[PDB]
Inverse folding.
């Protein structure tokens, strides 16, 4: 089915940085246009990096100029050798005909370009980005460029996970008055909700099989029974003793640490008291 | 405080004594916390009495 | 790996510290849930898609 | 019973020391009745009422000495020692008759509860 | 409602740091506060995007050594960096020389960024050390001498790709240097008196935070099976030891540091209680079903 | 799988050949869940006739455990050693399904065994067949199972399955609710502190405005 | 110099033998080393006093107990240090003025 | 006497937590009055 798209957690950060930069510079958020670069291996397409392309406006329409891309194409060839043009990204919602018009000269530059959509105004659990492939229609007349939606993967190299965890541990939670609770108790809440959704789907399938909407597949129900019988995990005495020991240890570690915040407030109080009601 | 041992006079045997680090750690921390609370309340009473000019004339 | 207690004549090979076993069991349960969901999705893709779409709303 | 509602209807809050506390602690000590004074001795005094004048240190010392004796009578030494210690370390410039019988008993209480006479702060 | 605050368009000071106050930058440059005292900026804050770009450049270098620039600004006592930009330099894994290619590359890339809409300037440079820790060598010390003495706002960055890959944590090291004349541990090298170290911090925007949290959301199994405080025990013990040393130093000083010690203790206690809370939540969710 | 390989031959045949085929299935290694074999109409038609004993044996293998082959030992035909070993393995799987720490005495009573070494060898061979995964412990006389395959399910127990899943769902929902409440409270607390601080600031600067006269 | 020998080899054999044990019998070591009980006890005492063998001798039951215990409870000691420091800081704050 | 895994000791630690938190709250309330005192703005 067409080509397999390999998306990396580096293009998205570039788009977000560009969007926030323009939003802060102009005050009123505007549309941003860039590019996508990577590798073509047979029927597989992978995206490595992304650099912005200058775009001009004429009347009300947007035009991608060729000279700036020509000058910038050989510039980054020095650092990245086996890197070639793939497509471009932009910010927006649904595919408007302006997208088709702007994609016309992209198809002129490269026969079959890819398309990336990032929607900062998303209110859904799905990935805000979307990958589209260009299709040329055969019907006579105005041959509109058709966007075929494909599947995007999350292929990553060795250093991606460690970097994202390192940056996401802090997130400057203690400077924006966002409360560390509102981060910790919320980050895993989404995972718990996802597990709830999966269990609900399994229960719905089991109920449908019981009623008779779906055929009696006498293989999935065995796995469902096995999953059912494995719910009370590790109800032994050793686990309970270890858990209680852990709880007591964390309680003591919190006591040593509350006892010093109280002491610091104590010190500040005596420092302020030694100036107001007592001379020197 | 040179030898950590216990004497059993029934069989006349000197046993070695092993200290449970977790238990003594918890006991010391609890004792320190109680002492600090007592000292804090004492000083706060002092601040209450040193602000009203109580000096036993 | 392991150690021998000669008094009781018992060889100990491997021991589990409870909490790592708990983590492993939780991971196994999650993997089982994922595999079951994949199996039902493969068996009846259209019904699974319809149920998912109904649950999105 | 009079100096329970007298105290309750005079202090701004329950953590305020008034001159009647030293009076109830003496009334309930001269006659052997220790339990009624317990609610007013289990709280930690936090502020002292100025009483728009008066309130010499005699009331404060009498309260913190009679409370110590009351606690000693009920065999609660870990707080009788604290009460006597608070009574002793009051600022003073001359010898008073009530601090003598608060150090004398302080030594005995420290010898009972602990193995030594505690060093004064 | 479930997330309470959410975000349509509102932001806070986290998103405010991404801007360019021309008058403020001009007046801090003209005033030159750091030219009067040696013990100026000690806090360096670098954005995520620059970090990943540096890491990918170092990895693409392989066993050899790479080298590139960085972009940002200075704000009061702190330094801000938010862009990485690689260079086409080659050489043996023990020495790299910037030929004319890099000289024609940095200017061209700066002009291209200015055409794009970028407004920041060169702030420093990053060099990858393949294996031999993170410490400035003699030639690095001389280069930093000349750079910080000619181009006063500057900072060097040294990372270790091999150790970062093997261990699992990054080896970012931000260094400024004491100028010549001011004279007033074998890991740091032999010129430990000439150069010193700085602390590192990171930031990300509201949009970046939302995107990172939503991307990391596809990690639920590890999220609810990690069981932290059992993997970072050594880190917490080291933190408590440093807490004890800082507390001793503060007590000696009292005879401020007490505020810093209180903040560090609060951070460690918050981490410990967060681990306990996650463990309790997991126990409630999994071990309290089907009797 | 093995059941698929042994299932296509059971369509055309009926009678003695069919019972021989089911005996071969019960003897063949690897087969441990007889769900589709029993679901066929040819197998179910054996109830009427002289082959009801084989149907009862198949039902006992599919759902019952070893003691069920105690009261009616004389009714069913003779079993070979392979069938007995398979039945013992199924009984072990059924026992491990309920509790995750099987005592040795319970296994000895359930499997009708006389020697501890023979029981340990049977458990070892069951683990080798890879139907359950676990480890033995002689000091506590325990067998710990980390994962056991689910056995056959009849078309009347499914409702019970639903119940358990429902319970799990409810629990998850409860946790979610608590989460929200907690975080809300936390946020409020933080806000309150900030607010009061701001108020104090206003007060003091107001004092400044009235003291610099 | 033959007395220095017939003792280093015995020490090496003893170290190599008691590695996987946690509670060993002294007569077993005597049988392995081809010496009587008294010499085995003297050798064990000398080795332990030199901080070479991590273990202790139970004279009542004639046993040697190794040191396959005492896990890494360094956390605890760190906490102890913290407690001590906290106590000191307490004396600084309460007794500042009042 | 006792190994520190009984939940009763957890309850005792929680009680000590509550007492310390209340003490710090009273300290902060006492300090806030000083911070707004008309005397403590002249120095």
């Amino acid at each position: 089915g067409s080509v397999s798209v390999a998306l990396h957690p580096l293009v998205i950060l570039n788009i977000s940085d560009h969007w926030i930069r323009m939003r802060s510079q102009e005050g009123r958020p505007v549309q941003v246009i860039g590019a996508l670069i990577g590798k073509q291996e047979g029927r597989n397409i992978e995206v490595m990096n992304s650099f912005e392309l200058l775009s001009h406006t004429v009347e009300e329409k947007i035009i991608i100029d060729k000279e700036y891309y020509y000058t910038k194409e050989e510039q980054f060839k020095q650092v990245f050798k086996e890197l070639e043009f793939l497509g471009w990204y932009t910010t927006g919602g649904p595919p408007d005909p302006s997208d088709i018009h702007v994609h016309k000269q992209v198809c002129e530059i490269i026969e079959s370009p890819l398309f990336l959509k990032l929607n900062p105004m998303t209110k859904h659990t799905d990935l805000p980005v979307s990958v589209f492939e260009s299709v040329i229609d055969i019907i006579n007349g105005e041959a509109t460029m058709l966007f075929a939606e494909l599947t995007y993967t999350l292929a990553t190299e060795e250093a991606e996970r460690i970097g994202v965890d390192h940056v996401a541990r802090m997130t400057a939670t203690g400077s924006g008055e966002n409360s560390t609770v509102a981060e910790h108790l919320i980050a895993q809440h989404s995972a718990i909700k996802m597990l709830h959704s999966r269990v609900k789907l399994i229960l719905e399938y089991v109920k449908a099989s019981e009623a008779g909407e779906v055929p009696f597949n006498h293989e999935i129900l065995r796995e469902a029974y096995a999953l059912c019988h494995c719910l009370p995990v590790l109800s032994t005495d050793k686990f309970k003793t270890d858990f209680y020991d852990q709880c007591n240890d964390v309680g003591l570690m919190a006591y040593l640490g509350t006892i010093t915040k109280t002491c610091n407030t104590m010190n500040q109080f005596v420092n302020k008291f030694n100036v107001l009601y007592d001379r020197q | 405080g040179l030898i950590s041992a216990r004497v059993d006079s029934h069989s006349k045997i000197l046993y070695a004594r092993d200290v449970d680090q977790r238990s003594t750690t918890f006991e010391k921390s609890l004792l320190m916390g109680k002492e600090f609370q007592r000292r804090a309340k004492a000083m706060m009473l002092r601040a209450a009495v040193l602000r009203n000019q109580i000096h036993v004339k | 790996n392991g150690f021998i207690d000669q008094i009781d004549g018992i060889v100990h090979f491997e021991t589990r510290e409870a909490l790592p076993t708990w983590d492993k069991q939780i991971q196994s349960l999650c993997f089982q849930v994922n595999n079951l969901l994949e199996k039902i999705s493969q068996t009846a893709p259209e019904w699974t898609a319809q149920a998912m779409e109904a649950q999105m709303a | 019973g009079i100096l329970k509602q007298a105290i309750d209807k005079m202090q701004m809050n329950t953590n305020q020391l008034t001159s009647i506390h030293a009076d109830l602690c003496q009334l309930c000590l001269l006659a052997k009745c220790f339990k009624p004074a317990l609610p007013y001795l289990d709280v930690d005094m936090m502020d002292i009422c100025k009483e728009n004048g008066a309130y010499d240190a005699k009331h404060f010392l009498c309260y913190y000495y009679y409370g110590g004796m009351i606690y000693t009578g009920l065999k609660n030494f870990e707080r009788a020692l604290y009460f006597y210690e608070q009574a002793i370390t009051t600022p003073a410039m001359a010898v008073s008759h009530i601090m003598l019988e608060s150090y004398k008993k302080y030594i005995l209480v420290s010898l009972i509860l602990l193995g030594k006479v505690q060093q004064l702060p | 409602t479930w997330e309470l605050a959410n975000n349509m368009q509102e932001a806070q000071s986290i998103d405010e740091i991404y801007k360019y106050d021309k008058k403020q930058q001009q007046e801090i440059l003209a005033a030159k506060p750091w030219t009067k005292d040696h013990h100026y900026f000690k806090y360096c804050k670098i954005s995520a995007l620059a970090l990943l770009k540096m890491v990918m450049h170092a990895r693409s270098g392989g066993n050899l050594a790479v080298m590139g620039l960085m972009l940002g600004k200075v704000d009061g006592e702190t330094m801000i960096i938010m862009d990485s930009f690689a260079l086409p330099v080659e050489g043996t894994e023990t020495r790299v020389n910037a030929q004319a290619a890099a000289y024609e590359y940095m200017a061209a890339y700066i002009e291209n960024a200015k055409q794009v809409g970028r407004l920041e300037n060169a702030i420093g440079w990053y060099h990858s050390h393949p294996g031999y820790g993170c410490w400035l060598s003699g030639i690095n010390v001389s280069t930093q001498m000349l750079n910080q003495q000619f181009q006063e706002p500057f900072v060097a960055v040294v990372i270790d790709p091999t150790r970062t890959i093997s261990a699992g944590k990054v080896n970012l090291g931000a260094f400024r240097t004491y100028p010549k004349g001011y004279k007033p541990i074998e890991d740091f090298g032999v010129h430990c008196k000439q150069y010193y170290a700085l602390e590192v911090s990171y930031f990300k925007s509201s949009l970046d935070r939302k995107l990172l949290e939503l991307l990391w959301n596809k990690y639920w199994v590890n999220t609810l099976s990690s069981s932290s405080l059992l993997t970072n025990a050594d880190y917490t013990t080291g933190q408590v030891f440093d807490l004890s040393e800082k507390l001793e130093q503060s007590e000696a000083q009292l005879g401020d540091k007490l505020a810093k010690a209180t903040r560090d203790s609060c951070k460690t206690t918050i981490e410990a209680i967060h681990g306990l809370m996650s463990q309790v939540i997991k126990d409630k969710l999994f071990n309290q079903i089907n009797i | 799988n093995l059941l698929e390989q042994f299932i296509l031959l059971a369509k055309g045949t009926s009678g003695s050949a069919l019972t021989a085929l089911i005996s071969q299935v019960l003897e063949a290694p690897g087969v441990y869940v007889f769900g589709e074999l029993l679901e066929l109409a040819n197998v179910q038609e054996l109830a009427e006739g002289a082959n009801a004993a084989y149907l009862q044996l198949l039902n006992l293998f599919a759902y019952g455990t070893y003691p069920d082959y105690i009261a009616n030992k004389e009714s069913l035909p003779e079993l070979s050693t392979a069938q007995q070993n398979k039945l013992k393995h199924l009984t072990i799987v059924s026992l491990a399904s309920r509790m995750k720490c099987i005592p040795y005495s319970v296994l000895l009573k359930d499997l009708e065994m006389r020697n501890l070494r023979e029981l340990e060898d049977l458990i070892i061979e069951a683990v080798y067949t890879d139907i359950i995964q676990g480890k033995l412990d002689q000091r506590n006389q325990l067998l710990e199972v980390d994962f056991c395959i689910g056995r056959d399910i009849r078309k009347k127990d499914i409702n019970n399955i639903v119940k358990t899943l429902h319970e799990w769902c409810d629990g998850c929902e409860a946790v979610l609710l608590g989460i929200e409440q907690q975080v809300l409270r936390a946020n409020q607390y933080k806000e309150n502190h900030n607010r009061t601080q701001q108020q104090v600031e206003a007060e003091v600067t107001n004092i400044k405005k009235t003291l610099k006269a | 110099h033959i007395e220095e020998l017939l003792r280093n080899i015995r020490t090496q054999v003893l170290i190599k033998l008691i590695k996987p044990y946690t509670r060993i019998h002294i007569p077993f070591i005597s049988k392995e080393l081809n010496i009587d009980v008294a010499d085995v006890e003297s050798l064990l005492v000398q080795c332990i006093l030199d901080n070479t063998i991590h273990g202790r001798i139970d004279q009542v039951n004639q046993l040697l107990e190794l040191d396959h215990q005492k896990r890494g409870g360094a956390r605890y000691t760190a906490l102890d240090k913290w407690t001590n420091q906290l106590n000191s800081l307490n004396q600084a704050v309460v007794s500042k003025l009042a | 006497p006792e190994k520190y895994n009984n939940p009763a000791m957890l309850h005792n630690i929680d009680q000590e937590m509550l007492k310390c938190i209340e003490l710090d709250e009273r300290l902060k309330a006492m300090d806030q009055e000083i911070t707004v005192n008309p005397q403590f703005v002249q120095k």
Observations:
- Strands of chain E lie at 43-47, 67-75, 78-86, 121-128, 155-159, 173-175, 199-203.
